[PDB]
Write a protein that binds this ligand. Structure first.
Ligand SMILES: [Mn+2]
Ligand SMILES: [Mn+2]
Ligand SMILES: [Mn+2]
Ligand SMILES: [Mn+2]
Lengths: 248, 248, 248, 248
């Protein structure tokens, strides 16, 4: 006797191909969460149809194909509102700072689509691993400064199409240092020095990243998180910034 | 860096906890704490150290009113005007088997959240209840048998007035095809298998039946109800979400 | 002043391509654990070299390439003993029982190589999701019978090259019913009936699977596990069988 | 089906636990239990129900001797001659900060295993100690700074004579670059940053230093020691394993 906002399949693991900024087609494994709105006067959705769209679907998952999948799901399941969400690991070939030795780095990307109330919204979320270094530990200590691996997460509601790599760079750029999978000894020296030279508190990280998200038209709203897995503790330091530019 | 941060603090701090039962008995459980505060735009950083001190000093059972005293003490000790406390912990209920009566303990995952922002104190209670599901379709189409799977019903509830988790569990255990038990006897296995078969329910029916009972409690202003069936026939889960705010 | 049996990198996520029994090349994401033995008179291994073998390596990961990687690692790291281990999700296009509707299913495959004491050993481990159904619940109940999703894991030490798909079939074949991602209504009926018709206890599952591993020459030893995620309980039923045919 | 099963029983049963401290104080913690028995070849199946009954009836602190009484009661109640009990739980130790002395609790993950097979009773103790690591290479090559990461040292120890976990933690906390604390003050952050810098250690050095101290305890017949550095500079971990059996 009541409508259900989300009703559908969840945790469907299924192969995916994305297209890199470099034009390459990247093959990965995704986890899909496809759901639809059920009108009160409807007893139940057709669950076999979700798995069928995933099997029928083909090609690289471009921004346009993503939107075409959301519409195809609503037409095939006979719905007016619904959401599609896929999570997958994404890889970028990076270049070491001094040696130039190429190596891959792994990011976690979640892509979401949602049509409700005649409005379609696309969301880009990337978790970017980075190195942080406390400025206090550096300032009060004769030698050394505590450093920890950090996870910067950018859940951005796109006003225009934004490459995930555009969000990864903002993260790596405003971080004390960015992670690389292979580092030569000349490279270990530079990363250890540049981090010490650029110590940033979690409040500084999220602030420095937010300013650049603020200044981007393609981002109408975003949730920004930064977690420092403190070496000196068994807990983490956490900071979240929420901004909807449509406010006002 | 001239920008406020809605949430800065410590994350994933495990620490021993004592809570108060509906009976008023105290249960000892381990908790994972999240303590964060709002940071003004002209403030460089909050005191991470103080958040842990509040956990070490705090003692005694975690009564609702005690949870509200802690949220104020946090703002008072970290010199903030807004902030949130989150704590999740396993919760046990001695259960009575349906036919034999053999007592057995069942575990649940409870999360309490308090939040002060814009001069409003809001308390939440989220519980995960483990329950059995049985497909109405399998039962009708098949000559014999009916596929059944373990389900997870999650009730996140903003409580205008305090409500025991026991009260939340009941709405889910009662509205499920059948409740779970740790110890069952041959008499009790027959009842659970027969009763579940006699009350088949789709993920859509389950959330709808739990919503109607959550809609009828004055204490619960708002809620986000989730039901996930781990389908035996597939390696993917069925899902349904109902969100209701009684203010709107 | 002492040797270290395993010393190296761990949790290196990195893209992988395997070749299916159907000749196809399957692209997936792997997690690598590459380690080497350190002689007492050696202070430390070269960790940058592990990541370099992964970046340098190419082609589908065939059984032969896997062995050639283990040797290349020992030669490149200047070791006499060492281990390589990659974990990745693997997909098979299955056909529904009555409708024939094709759909993918996801398995977790771990491949291990180890050279020690002049002996090289290759191990194949596949986790196969399956449906189980209690024979007691069926025997003591007027209607219905409890059914749960199960995970059958086969860690087999190969005496000859064995396709992972050969191990997945043994698992799906001796199970009450095998999982399919897309099932039509004719298909739901068959899977619900065949399971009820073939109820098997966890002790029966592992026994029925072991007999077929026993009778396979390509398997010199294996660890077999079966976990039933009981619908009627919040815990699981577990059975493990260990067999080394070289015993005697 | 004419084949023995080395391990049949229940898995992942969470249940509240009380353990005894080296001080003799009792600590309340939640446990996840694994109770299995050996099944003869001519036996169709063990009684799953009895395993949970043993957990409900059992009370009082989990003293070593009490753990050994439970292993016998299990074989006696399930009518078996071989079997294993495993229980893992968070463990806390009030810690004292190095300069200020501010007490703070730190958590560890402890796993106790008992095993009767071939008429031998074997007790084990596995603990995970959270510790900080600092690279000796970064310290030498770099002009300023030194990269540091949180590490996990795991000691699995077959105990001929009972040993408190406190004794295991000490060997790891002492042999690490620096121990972890929940609450630290500006004086204590300086000490930890300086001390860790003053005692750099490679994953290989750490396991080697912990082994020598584990080799010198008569109570510990055998052990598998693991050390994993979550390197800040990379998204992958350093690893080292040392396995020693003092019988061989
Ligand atoms: Mn710090
Ligand atoms: Mn069904
Ligand atoms: Mn049963
Ligand atoms: Mn290093």
């Amino acid at each position: 006797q009541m409508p259900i906002q989300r009703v559908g399949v969840r945790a469907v693991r299924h192969p995916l191909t994305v297209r890199t900024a470099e034009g390459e087609t990247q093959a990965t494994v995704g986890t899909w969460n496809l759901d639809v709105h059920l009108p009160a006067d409807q007893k139940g959705t057709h669950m076999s149809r979700f798995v069928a769209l995933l099997e029928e679907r083909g090609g690289p998952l471009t921004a346009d194909a993503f939107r075409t999948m959301l519409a195809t799901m609503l037409e095939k399941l006979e719905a007016r509102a619904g959401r599609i969400e896929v999570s997958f690991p994404y890889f970028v070939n990076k270049t070491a700072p001094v040696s130039g030795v190429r190596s891959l780095l792994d990011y976690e990307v979640t892509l979401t689509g949602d049509v409700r109330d005649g409005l379609t919204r696309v969301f880009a979320k990337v978790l970017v691993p980075v190195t942080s270094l406390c400025p206090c530990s550096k300032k009060i200590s004769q030698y050394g400064a505590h450093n920890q691996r950090s996870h910067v997460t950018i859940d951005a509601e796109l006003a225009a199409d934004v490459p995930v790599e555009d969000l990864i760079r903002i993260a790596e750029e405003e971080a004390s240092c960015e992670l690389w999978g292979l580092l030569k000894r000349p490279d270990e020296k530079f990363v250890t020095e540049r981090a010490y030279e650029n110590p940033k508190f979690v409040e500084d990280l999220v602030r420095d990243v937010a300013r650049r998200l603020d200044a981007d038209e393609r981002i109408v709203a975003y949730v920004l998180e930064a977690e420092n897995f403190e070496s000196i503790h068994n807990h983490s330091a956490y900071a979240l910034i929420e901004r909807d530019k449509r406010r006002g």
